[PDB]
Symmetry: none
Subunit: 152 residues, 2 copies
Amino acid sequence: NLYFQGERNYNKWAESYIKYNLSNLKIEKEDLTIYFDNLQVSGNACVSIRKGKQINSFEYIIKFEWLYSKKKEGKDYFGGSVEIPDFSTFSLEENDYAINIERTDESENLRFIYDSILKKEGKEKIKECLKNFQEDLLKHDKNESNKELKIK
Amino acid sequence: SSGRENLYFQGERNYNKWAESYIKYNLSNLKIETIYFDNLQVSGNACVSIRKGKQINSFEYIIKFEWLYSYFGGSVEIPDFSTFSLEENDYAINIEDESENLRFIYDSILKKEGKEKIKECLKNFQEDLLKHDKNESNKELKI
């Protein structure tokens, strides 16, 4: 009945958005670039219209990997995993969701990268990357409205 | 029915003038060669909407006219020219006259060839309605 009442499922769009944004996110330092790959995005996204207003609900687990380039030396390395277990309408509003970052091994190089860049700035930049999700979801929803009711 | 449709629905476009003019113009210009058609009355409604991502149409018409051979020959009615009539072109046409002249022509021409020609004339009505509505939208795209 929700579909007949105008709710639309945007899981494919949301998966694509989250993948695109994080796979293009680069954290640029003096001698290092942090980047991301291998994005699993699992969950749901939908919007309906109630009395002229968009009502949205989304929730995602985003699990991916982080890597780094020794910028001045032209070598890329695997770093570890990143898990955002609860990226949702509720957790986005307060921008307070967890980002759990792990290192692939116990080496000194990765500890330095994690401590110096990832644990604070890296998390900050990931959140900045994702912060417009709800606004972009709503714009996507508007074009679905166009597709169904305005395009001949 | 949904909040989405209530906000964004662009309305039920009415094409009464276009539909009446199309039926009238096409039937008035139809000859069987000589049998002609005159005195056209076209009564009804036609509409096109965009819903569910597609053009949706409906129409419902009575069409009345007279036929002449050249002399007044009589009258014709198409009682129900409607939305799904042109899928199979299997709507009724009533053709009506007591002389032997009018009888033979009715039996030898109007009954089969007359009705086939009338139906052929009108068979593209729905397709042409949809194309008219599309070009009515197109009108706004280069302005």
